[PDB]
Amino acid sequence: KSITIATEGSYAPYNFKDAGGKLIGFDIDLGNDLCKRMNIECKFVEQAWDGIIPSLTAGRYDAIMAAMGIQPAREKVIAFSRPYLLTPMTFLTTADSPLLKTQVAIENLPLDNITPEQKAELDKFTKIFEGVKFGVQAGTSHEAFMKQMMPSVQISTYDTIDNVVMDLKAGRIDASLASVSFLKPLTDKPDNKDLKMFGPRMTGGLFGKGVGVGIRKEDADLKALFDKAIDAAIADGTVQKLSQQWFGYDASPKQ
Template sequence: MKKTLTTLAAVAAIAVAGIAADASAKEWGKGSKIKIATEGAYAPWNFTDSAGKLVGFEVDLAADLCKRMEVECEVIQQAWEGIIPALQAGKYDVIMAGMSITEKRMEVISFSRAYAATPAVFVVTTGNKSAGFKTAVDALTLEEIDAAEKTALDAVVKEFKGKTIGVQISTTHENFLREYLGKDATIKTYDTQENLDLDLQAGRVDAALASASYWVPLLASDKGKGMVMVGPGMTGGPFGNGVGAGIRKEDKALNDMFTKAINASIADGTSKKLAVQWFGFDASAK
């Protein structure tokens, strides 16, 4: 799915300086009270409904995991920018916000095992010249690229050369664009995915890059009319290793609890059921 942060160095500095609220690990177990932060602006992963209530795949998954752990959980909304520093400062205990597991993030926080994994995909409007863009391979893995994948990646770079591409700021998707298209395309960042969608439909950007788990339900709705996914689905490399729960490094017991609960949710099919319900396809981790 989404996301990486540009503020990791600042977070590390905060941790070193001892600004975190509690540098020692808390005691975690049955009956614990756990505060979980989510962005609340990345449907269908997490968002607020018309009544202002937090809903979405991660909200429902959190409820399932907390029941399995026999703990009391509160899910709160937190802006994406600053979500890791606030975890480090003790504002909450866990992040479930479509956060991809990356090596850079793991320098400052730990992650549970992945609970979801979806490819990144470009979207354009149906009237755009790139609307029919395809590559010989449908799936492009950026870990160990073979000849066919290299050809597909080169085709992606060529297709979007000279274009203006929109992306949510401080995400793994932005990282990909900076790494592979930073010299060849204009990259325009947005504070929320919704604002990016508006500019895409208005023609202020030529293309947008985000997770397929975001695009599939959007394009099936009225809000996604006139938009189409193009090119290969991309995973690995700058996109990380799936989406997991972000947890302070010192809270190993809490991490173990979440990983055990996620394993159980995957094993009995609950995470798959929730993924199909919210995304329209199985985006659960394997």
């Protein structure tokens, strides 16, 4: 038994290339680890984003591991394994903003079945955000979360996240909300040490279920094999270990 897994190869640290052009990254290391548990051979191939789903349905390969968010639009065409990595979102402000002084009672905040303690934390931040100029990228889940969960907060919209960042550095806005995968490398750059992430690391709700293995709907047995492998990889700490290695934070889901 052997499967071909498609990835982008242009989305570091999920899937990208080494100096020799070989596919590397979290998706590649996890894909190989999952296939090893499944006792199946693994081959990674490159596929441009626009054709990644049609080429799966055309049968060019058996699965997709390309930081693909499990979402209703994709679920209309393909099936997904259980999530293999969460997609945390967090807030961004300037270094020395008073917003950094706000104590974070719960670091990880899953939004789906919000506990009274979790809701109290989200209300506490929403309260402070009342007097803060907020900026968000238009058409994103970040804009949706602010419009649905934080109506008490004034928001301005931008075409790109780079433009949100430029206006925060210019002082036109005081804070933002974006993905940790974008914000962590951004704030790690010496030229951006005047910026800081803060607040809860949120997942679920409007932010989706996380990333999953894209599989043809008919391949029920392959999804079952992937689900068993993912649960075993979460259970033994492999997902957590690879998450820390590739991202510098733990985005592993619950088993």
